[PDB]
Protein backbone atom coordinates (compact mmCIF):
# COMPACT_ATOMS: atom_id res chain seq x y z
CA UNK A 1 0.00 0.00 0.00
CA UNK A 2 2.67 2.60 0.83
CA UNK A 3 5.31 2.18 -2.26
CA UNK A 4 7.85 4.41 -3.85
CA UNK A 5 8.27 3.84 -7.45
CA UNK A 6 11.88 4.21 -9.19
CA UNK A 7 12.39 5.64 -12.55
CA UNK A 8 14.18 2.83 -14.95
CA UNK A 9 17.80 2.53 -15.45
CA UNK A 10 20.03 5.29 -17.34
CA UNK A 11 23.31 5.16 -18.93
CA UNK A 12 24.92 8.41 -19.42
CA UNK A 13 28.50 9.77 -20.56
CA UNK A 14 30.98 11.70 -18.27
CA UNK A 15 30.15 15.27 -17.85
CA UNK A 16 26.39 14.81 -18.68
CA UNK A 17 23.15 15.53 -16.72
CA UNK A 18 20.86 12.26 -15.34
CA UNK A 19 17.36 13.08 -13.91
CA UNK A 20 15.71 10.16 -11.52
CA UNK A 21 12.31 10.24 -10.12
CA UNK A 22 10.88 8.36 -6.96
CA UNK A 23 6.81 8.25 -7.21
CA UNK A 24 5.16 7.74 -3.90
CA UNK A 25 2.35 6.80 -3.31
CA UNK A 26 -0.53 5.30 -0.65
CA UNK A 27 -0.10 8.27 1.80
CA UNK A 28 0.22 11.39 2.07
CA UNK A 29 3.71 12.79 0.01
CA UNK A 30 4.30 15.70 2.10
CA UNK A 31 3.94 14.60 5.42
CA UNK A 32 7.16 12.90 5.28
CA UNK A 33 10.69 13.49 4.44
CA UNK A 34 12.27 11.81 1.43
CA UNK A 35 16.28 10.07 1.90
CA UNK A 36 18.44 9.17 -0.99
CA UNK A 37 20.79 6.42 -0.75
CA UNK A 38 24.19 5.68 -2.94
CA UNK A 39 25.14 1.79 -3.49
CA UNK A 40 28.11 1.80 -5.39
CA UNK A 41 28.51 -1.67 -7.33
CA UNK A 42 29.12 -4.14 -4.91
CA UNK A 43 29.44 -1.72 -1.91
CA UNK A 44 27.45 -0.60 0.95
CA UNK A 45 24.95 1.74 1.57
CA UNK A 46 25.88 5.67 2.09
CA UNK A 47 23.01 8.67 2.56
CA UNK A 48 23.13 11.15 0.48
CA UNK A 49 20.87 13.45 2.62
CA UNK A 50 17.32 14.46 2.29
CA UNK A 51 14.54 16.80 1.30
CA UNK A 52 11.98 17.85 3.33
CA UNK A 53 8.32 17.49 1.43
CA UNK A 54 6.54 20.33 2.96
CA UNK A 55 9.19 23.04 2.76
CA UNK A 56 11.31 21.53 -0.22
CA UNK A 57 14.17 22.08 1.37
CA UNK A 58 17.33 19.67 0.39
CA UNK A 59 20.13 19.07 2.91
CA UNK A 60 23.22 16.69 1.27
CA UNK A 61 25.86 15.38 3.40
CA UNK A 62 29.48 16.91 2.12
CA UNK A 63 29.78 13.88 0.34
CA UNK A 64 27.28 15.08 -2.09
CA UNK A 65 27.65 18.79 -1.95
CA UNK A 66 28.03 20.31 -5.40
CA UNK A 67 26.55 18.35 -8.06
CA UNK A 68 23.43 16.65 -6.92
CA UNK A 69 20.04 18.58 -6.38
CA UNK A 70 17.13 16.95 -4.96
CA UNK A 71 13.75 18.69 -5.76
CA UNK A 72 10.01 18.21 -5.87
CA UNK A 73 6.82 17.85 -8.08
CA UNK A 74 4.88 17.68 -4.97
CA UNK A 75 1.42 17.91 -7.03
CA UNK A 76 2.23 14.57 -8.62
CA UNK A 77 4.05 13.00 -5.70
CA UNK A 78 7.47 12.72 -7.04
CA UNK A 79 10.68 12.84 -5.95
CA UNK A 80 13.89 13.30 -7.80
CA UNK A 81 17.53 12.88 -7.91
CA UNK A 82 19.72 15.07 -10.31
CA UNK A 83 23.28 14.53 -10.61
CA UNK A 84 25.22 17.05 -12.57
CA UNK A 85 28.46 16.83 -14.67
CA UNK A 86 28.52 12.85 -14.24
CA UNK A 87 31.84 10.87 -13.49
CA UNK A 88 32.64 7.24 -13.68
CA UNK A 89 32.50 6.90 -9.64
CA UNK A 90 28.89 8.52 -10.03
CA UNK A 91 27.79 4.81 -11.31
CA UNK A 92 25.76 3.18 -8.67
CA UNK A 93 22.01 2.41 -7.78
CA UNK A 94 20.21 5.32 -5.93
CA UNK A 95 17.62 4.67 -3.95
CA UNK A 96 15.17 6.71 -2.21
CA UNK A 97 13.13 6.15 1.15
CA UNK A 98 10.75 7.43 2.94
CA UNK A 99 10.71 8.79 6.41
CA UNK A 100 8.11 7.56 9.44
CA UNK A 101 8.92 8.63 12.90
CA UNK A 102 10.29 6.25 14.16
CA UNK A 103 13.00 5.98 11.12
CA UNK A 104 13.95 7.87 8.49
CA UNK A 105 14.42 5.03 6.07
CA UNK A 106 11.22 2.90 6.55
CA UNK A 107 9.87 2.16 3.07
CA UNK A 108 12.34 2.00 0.27
CA UNK A 109 12.25 2.35 -3.67
CA UNK A 110 13.23 -0.49 -5.82
CA UNK A 111 16.29 1.86 -6.71
CA UNK A 112 17.60 3.01 -10.38
CA UNK A 113 21.27 2.19 -11.64
CA UNK A 114 23.07 5.12 -13.60
CA UNK A 115 25.69 3.96 -15.54
CA UNK A 116 28.45 6.38 -16.31
CA UNK A 117 30.75 5.38 -19.59
CA UNK A 118 31.85 6.60 -22.26
CA UNK A 119 31.45 2.94 -24.38
CA UNK A 120 29.94 2.16 -27.53
CA UNK A 121 27.81 -0.70 -27.96
CA UNK A 122 30.50 -3.19 -28.91
CA UNK A 123 30.10 -7.47 -29.27
CA UNK A 124 32.16 -9.76 -27.08
CA UNK A 125 34.65 -11.74 -28.63
CA UNK A 126 34.24 -15.27 -27.32
CA UNK A 127 37.23 -17.99 -27.57
CA UNK A 128 37.05 -21.54 -26.24
CA UNK A 129 38.95 -23.10 -23.40
CA UNK A 130 39.58 -26.65 -23.63
CA UNK A 131 42.38 -28.96 -22.45
CA UNK A 132 45.16 -30.78 -24.85
CA UNK A 133 43.95 -33.90 -26.27
CA UNK A 134 46.11 -36.13 -24.91
CA UNK A 135 46.10 -34.02 -21.64
CA UNK A 136 45.86 -36.67 -18.72
CA UNK A 137 42.27 -37.35 -17.41
CA UNK A 138 39.86 -37.84 -14.81
CA UNK A 139 36.36 -38.50 -14.38
CA UNK A 140 35.92 -35.18 -14.90
CA UNK A 141 36.97 -32.51 -17.48
CA UNK A 142 36.69 -28.93 -17.04
CA UNK A 143 35.65 -26.90 -20.00
CA UNK A 144 34.95 -22.60 -20.70
CA UNK A 145 34.59 -19.96 -22.81
CA UNK A 146 36.58 -17.11 -22.29
CA UNK A 147 33.98 -13.78 -23.50
CA UNK A 148 36.56 -10.46 -23.76
CA UNK A 149 35.39 -6.99 -24.75
CA UNK A 150 31.77 -6.15 -24.83
CA UNK A 151 29.74 -3.48 -24.06
CA UNK A 152 26.83 -2.99 -22.55
CA UNK A 153 26.18 -5.56 -19.54
CA UNK A 154 24.78 -8.29 -20.04
CA UNK A 155 25.35 -11.04 -22.10
CA UNK A 156 23.53 -14.40 -21.56
CA UNK A 157 25.94 -17.81 -21.47
CA UNK A 158 24.51 -21.27 -21.99
CA UNK A 159 26.41 -24.74 -22.58
CA UNK A 160 24.46 -27.01 -25.27
CA UNK A 161 21.45 -24.83 -25.44
CA UNK A 162 20.90 -24.82 -21.21
CA UNK A 163 21.00 -28.73 -21.73
CA UNK A 164 24.26 -28.24 -19.43
CA UNK A 165 23.68 -26.08 -16.09
CA UNK A 166 24.45 -28.12 -13.26
CA UNK A 167 28.31 -28.31 -14.08
CA UNK A 168 28.48 -24.16 -15.11
CA UNK A 169 30.57 -21.63 -13.20
CA UNK A 170 29.02 -18.39 -15.19
CA UNK A 171 31.75 -15.92 -13.07
CA UNK A 172 30.45 -11.75 -12.98
CA UNK A 173 31.33 -9.40 -15.66
CA UNK A 174 34.14 -7.44 -14.80
CA UNK A 175 35.72 -4.06 -16.43
CA UNK A 176 38.68 -5.07 -18.24
CA UNK A 177 38.63 -1.11 -19.89
CA UNK A 178 35.74 0.95 -20.91
CA UNK A 179 34.41 -2.75 -21.65
CA UNK A 180 33.29 -6.31 -19.46
CA UNK A 181 34.95 -9.13 -19.57
CA UNK A 182 33.64 -12.92 -18.10
CA UNK A 183 34.23 -16.36 -18.55
CA UNK A 184 32.39 -19.40 -18.23
CA UNK A 185 33.94 -22.92 -17.16
CA UNK A 186 31.66 -26.26 -17.34
CA UNK A 187 32.51 -29.47 -15.90
CA UNK A 188 31.31 -33.00 -17.21
CA UNK A 189 32.53 -36.51 -16.92
CA UNK A 190 35.48 -37.35 -19.43
CA UNK A 191 33.10 -40.08 -20.48
CA UNK A 192 30.93 -37.29 -22.08
CA UNK A 193 33.31 -35.28 -23.71
CA UNK A 194 34.51 -35.19 -26.17
CA UNK A 195 32.01 -38.13 -27.29
CA UNK A 196 29.34 -35.89 -27.57
CA UNK A 197 29.86 -32.05 -28.46
CA UNK A 198 29.70 -29.34 -25.54
CA UNK A 199 28.84 -25.75 -27.27
CA UNK A 200 28.78 -22.27 -25.28
CA UNK A 201 25.93 -20.09 -26.32
CA UNK A 202 26.51 -16.35 -26.11
CA UNK A 203 23.87 -13.70 -26.54
CA UNK A 204 24.38 -9.85 -26.77
CA UNK A 205 21.54 -8.73 -27.09
CA UNK A 206 22.46 -5.14 -27.08
CA UNK A 207 24.91 -5.88 -30.43
CA UNK A 208 21.90 -8.41 -31.75
CA UNK A 209 24.64 -11.36 -31.52
CA UNK A 210 24.52 -14.56 -30.39
CA UNK A 211 28.07 -17.04 -30.80
CA UNK A 212 28.39 -20.22 -30.56
CA UNK A 213 31.71 -21.77 -29.54
CA UNK A 214 32.08 -25.81 -30.17
CA UNK A 215 34.78 -26.74 -28.05
CA UNK A 216 37.29 -28.71 -29.22
CA UNK A 217 40.40 -30.28 -27.57
CA UNK A 218 42.99 -27.38 -27.76
CA UNK B 1 30.35 10.50 12.35
CA UNK B 2 28.91 7.40 14.49
CA UNK B 3 31.06 4.65 13.27
CA UNK B 4 28.46 1.73 13.29
CA UNK B 5 31.17 -1.72 13.81
CA UNK B 6 29.21 -4.42 12.43
CA UNK B 7 31.13 -8.14 13.59
CA UNK B 8 31.55 -10.31 11.65
CA UNK B 9 31.91 -9.60 8.23
CA UNK B 10 30.81 -12.67 7.33
CA UNK B 11 28.93 -15.14 9.30
CA UNK B 12 28.62 -18.77 8.11
CA UNK B 13 25.06 -20.21 9.49
CA UNK B 14 22.89 -23.41 8.99
CA UNK B 15 19.49 -23.53 8.06
CA UNK B 16 17.20 -24.64 11.02
CA UNK B 17 19.88 -23.33 13.56
CA UNK B 18 19.82 -20.07 15.12
CA UNK B 19 22.36 -16.96 14.12
CA UNK B 20 23.97 -13.82 15.79
CA UNK B 21 25.63 -10.71 14.65
CA UNK B 22 26.67 -7.64 16.50
CA UNK B 23 26.44 -4.32 15.66
CA UNK B 24 28.02 -1.58 18.14
CA UNK B 25 28.34 2.12 17.77
CA UNK B 26 31.21 4.43 18.84
CA UNK B 27 28.86 6.47 21.22
CA UNK B 28 25.39 5.79 22.56
CA UNK B 29 22.66 5.61 20.06
CA UNK B 30 20.32 6.75 23.16
CA UNK B 31 18.73 10.06 22.19
CA UNK B 32 18.18 12.85 24.42
CA UNK B 33 14.38 12.44 23.22
CA UNK B 34 14.60 9.00 25.42
CA UNK B 35 14.27 7.08 22.43
CA UNK B 36 17.01 4.76 20.73
CA UNK B 37 17.47 4.82 16.96
CA UNK B 38 18.86 1.64 16.15
CA UNK B 39 17.75 0.32 12.67
CA UNK B 40 18.43 -3.69 10.86
CA UNK B 41 17.80 -3.87 6.97
CA UNK B 42 18.15 -6.77 5.32
CA UNK B 43 19.36 -6.70 1.14
CA UNK B 44 18.87 -9.90 -0.92
CA UNK B 45 20.96 -10.82 -3.77
CA UNK B 46 19.64 -8.43 -6.55
CA UNK B 47 17.08 -6.84 -4.31
CA UNK B 48 16.72 -4.03 -2.51
CA UNK B 49 16.72 -3.03 1.28
CA UNK B 50 14.40 -3.78 3.12
CA UNK B 51 13.40 -2.44 6.92
CA UNK B 52 13.71 -5.10 9.17
CA UNK B 53 14.22 -3.65 13.30
CA UNK B 54 13.52 -0.04 14.47
CA UNK B 55 14.46 1.31 17.80
CA UNK B 56 16.34 -1.40 18.57
CA UNK B 57 13.67 -4.27 19.13
CA UNK B 58 10.35 -3.45 16.89
CA UNK B 59 9.97 -5.37 14.09
CA UNK B 60 8.38 -3.85 11.22
CA UNK B 61 4.80 -5.53 9.82
CA UNK B 62 5.55 -8.63 8.21
CA UNK B 63 8.74 -9.09 9.08
CA UNK B 64 9.27 -12.72 10.40
CA UNK B 65 9.43 -13.07 14.48
CA UNK B 66 12.18 -15.46 13.86
CA UNK B 67 14.01 -11.95 13.95
CA UNK B 68 14.70 -10.48 17.46
CA UNK B 69 16.36 -6.78 17.76
CA UNK B 70 18.18 -6.04 21.34
CA UNK B 71 20.64 -4.23 22.85
CA UNK B 72 21.09 -0.54 24.24
CA UNK B 73 23.58 2.62 24.27
CA UNK B 74 26.32 1.34 21.73
CA UNK B 75 25.65 -2.48 21.89
CA UNK B 76 23.17 -4.30 19.61
CA UNK B 77 22.43 -7.79 18.85
CA UNK B 78 20.11 -9.00 15.83
CA UNK B 79 19.18 -12.66 16.68
CA UNK B 80 17.50 -14.82 14.63
CA UNK B 81 15.92 -17.89 16.00
CA UNK B 82 15.88 -20.49 13.14
CA UNK B 83 17.65 -19.61 9.84
CA UNK B 84 16.07 -20.10 6.68
CA UNK B 85 17.09 -19.79 2.99
CA UNK B 86 15.51 -16.51 2.67
CA UNK B 87 17.58 -14.70 5.48
CA UNK B 88 20.50 -15.23 3.21
CA UNK B 89 21.80 -11.30 2.39
CA UNK B 90 23.70 -8.48 3.80
CA UNK B 91 22.65 -7.15 7.06
CA UNK B 92 23.28 -3.56 7.75
CA UNK B 93 22.83 -1.98 10.97
CA UNK B 94 22.51 1.74 10.86
CA UNK B 95 21.98 5.22 13.01
CA UNK B 96 19.44 7.89 13.00
CA UNK B 97 20.58 9.16 16.44
CA UNK B 98 23.27 11.45 15.40
CA UNK B 99 23.43 13.05 12.11
CA UNK B 100 24.65 12.25 9.43
CA UNK B 101 22.71 9.13 9.60
CA UNK B 102 25.37 6.25 9.48
CA UNK B 103 25.52 2.49 8.08
CA UNK B 104 27.27 -0.48 9.22
CA UNK B 105 29.65 -2.08 6.55
CA UNK B 106 27.45 -5.03 6.74
CA UNK B 107 27.19 -7.96 7.80
CA UNK B 108 26.71 -10.93 4.78
CA UNK B 109 25.21 -14.46 6.04
CA UNK B 110 26.55 -17.79 4.31
CA UNK B 111 25.82 -21.51 4.28
CA UNK B 112 28.39 -23.39 6.41
CA UNK B 113 29.15 -26.84 4.61
CA UNK B 114 32.52 -28.85 4.83
CA UNK B 115 36.03 -27.50 3.69
CA UNK B 116 36.67 -28.18 -0.01
CA UNK B 117 39.91 -27.47 -2.04
CA UNK B 118 39.78 -25.83 -5.32
CA UNK B 119 40.17 -27.96 -8.51
CA UNK B 120 42.33 -25.44 -10.51
CA UNK B 121 42.50 -25.67 -14.38
CA UNK B 122 44.58 -23.46 -16.80
CA UNK B 123 44.05 -22.86 -20.22
CA UNK B 124 46.86 -21.44 -22.94
CA UNK B 125 45.30 -18.04 -25.36
CA UNK B 126 43.16 -20.01 -27.61
CA UNK B 127 44.28 -20.22 -31.68
CA UNK B 128 41.95 -18.13 -32.44
CA UNK B 129 43.11 -15.41 -29.98
CA UNK B 130 46.53 -15.92 -31.36
CA UNK B 131 45.12 -15.01 -34.12
CA UNK B 132 44.11 -11.31 -33.38
CA UNK B 133 47.64 -10.92 -31.77
CA UNK B 134 45.78 -11.36 -28.10
CA UNK B 135 47.17 -13.57 -25.56
CA UNK B 136 44.15 -14.21 -22.69
CA UNK B 137 45.53 -16.95 -19.92
CA UNK B 138 42.47 -18.30 -18.02
CA UNK B 139 42.47 -20.33 -14.74
CA UNK B 140 39.80 -21.59 -13.15
CA UNK B 141 39.71 -21.87 -9.13
CA UNK B 142 36.54 -24.22 -8.75
CA UNK B 143 34.35 -25.72 -6.17
CA UNK B 144 36.32 -24.81 -3.03
CA UNK B 145 34.67 -23.79 0.51
CA UNK B 146 35.37 -21.09 2.50
CA UNK B 147 35.29 -18.64 0.03
CA UNK B 148 38.39 -16.95 1.01
CA UNK B 149 41.00 -17.46 -1.55
CA UNK B 150 44.36 -16.11 -2.95
CA UNK B 151 45.96 -16.70 -6.59
CA UNK B 152 49.19 -15.60 -7.88
CA UNK B 153 50.77 -15.58 -11.82
CA UNK B 154 54.40 -16.18 -12.33
CA UNK B 155 56.07 -15.98 -15.65
CA UNK B 156 59.33 -18.19 -15.99
CA UNK B 157 59.11 -19.00 -12.70
CA UNK B 158 59.21 -15.13 -11.19
CA UNK B 159 56.33 -13.73 -9.32
CA UNK B 160 54.72 -11.48 -11.95
CA UNK B 161 51.99 -10.93 -14.58
CA UNK B 162 50.29 -7.86 -16.99
CA UNK B 163 46.90 -7.39 -16.91
CA UNK B 164 45.25 -9.59 -14.62
CA UNK B 165 41.07 -9.96 -14.34
CA UNK B 166 39.98 -11.58 -11.36
CA UNK B 167 35.98 -12.59 -11.45
CA UNK B 168 34.17 -14.38 -8.22
CA UNK B 169 31.13 -15.89 -7.90
CA UNK B 170 28.56 -15.69 -5.07
CA UNK B 171 27.64 -19.21 -3.22
CA UNK B 172 26.84 -21.94 -5.40
CA UNK B 173 23.22 -22.44 -5.02
CA UNK B 174 23.88 -26.58 -5.57
CA UNK B 175 26.49 -27.18 -3.19
CA UNK B 176 27.26 -24.17 -1.20
CA UNK B 177 30.55 -23.41 -2.61
CA UNK B 178 32.51 -20.61 -4.13
CA UNK B 179 34.84 -19.97 -7.60
CA UNK B 180 37.04 -17.76 -8.44
CA UNK B 181 38.28 -17.09 -12.44
CA UNK B 182 41.52 -15.30 -12.98
CA UNK B 183 42.61 -14.31 -16.20
CA UNK B 184 46.27 -12.67 -17.55
CA UNK B 185 45.75 -11.15 -20.38
CA UNK B 186 48.68 -9.73 -22.81
CA UNK B 187 50.06 -8.81 -26.56
CA UNK B 188 50.42 -12.32 -28.50
CA UNK B 189 54.27 -11.01 -28.75
CA UNK B 190 54.67 -9.98 -25.10
CA UNK B 191 53.16 -14.12 -25.08
CA UNK B 192 56.05 -15.17 -27.15
CA UNK B 193 58.88 -13.70 -24.74
CA UNK B 194 58.25 -16.02 -22.01
CA UNK B 195 57.85 -19.93 -21.77
CA UNK B 196 56.80 -21.01 -18.51
CA UNK B 197 53.10 -19.85 -17.08
CA UNK B 198 51.89 -21.00 -13.54
CA UNK B 199 48.32 -19.91 -11.57
CA UNK B 200 49.34 -20.90 -8.02
CA UNK B 201 46.24 -21.39 -5.96
CA UNK B 202 46.40 -20.74 -1.73
CA UNK B 203 43.57 -21.53 0.13
CA UNK B 204 43.12 -22.84 3.97
CA UNK B 205 42.83 -26.25 2.88
CA UNK B 206 46.62 -27.09 2.41
CA UNK B 207 49.64 -25.10 3.76
CA UNK B 208 50.70 -25.59 -0.28
CA UNK B 209 49.42 -23.89 -2.71
CA UNK B 210 48.15 -25.71 -6.03
CA UNK B 211 50.15 -24.78 -9.12
CA UNK B 212 48.99 -25.67 -12.08
CA UNK B 213 51.47 -24.73 -15.27
CA UNK B 214 51.80 -24.83 -18.86
CA UNK B 215 55.11 -24.49 -21.58
CA UNK B 216 54.19 -22.08 -24.25
CA UNK B 217 53.97 -25.05 -27.10
Known amino acids: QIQLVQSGPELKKPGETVKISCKAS????????IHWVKQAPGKGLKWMGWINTETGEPTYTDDFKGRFAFSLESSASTAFLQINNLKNEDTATYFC???????????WGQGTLVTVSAAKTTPPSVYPLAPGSAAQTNSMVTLGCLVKGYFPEPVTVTWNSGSLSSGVHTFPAVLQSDLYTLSSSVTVPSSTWPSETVTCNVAHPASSTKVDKKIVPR | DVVMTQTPLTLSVTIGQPASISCKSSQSLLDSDGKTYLNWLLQRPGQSPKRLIY???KLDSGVPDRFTGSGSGTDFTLKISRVEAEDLGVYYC?????????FGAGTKLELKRADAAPTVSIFPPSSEQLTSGGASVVCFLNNFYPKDINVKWKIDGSERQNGVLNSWTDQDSKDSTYSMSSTLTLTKDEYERHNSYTCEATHKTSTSPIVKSFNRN
Open chain 2, 55 to 57: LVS
Open chain 1, 97 to 107: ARATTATELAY
Open chain 2, 94 to 102: WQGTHFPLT
Open chain 1, 26 to 33: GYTFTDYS
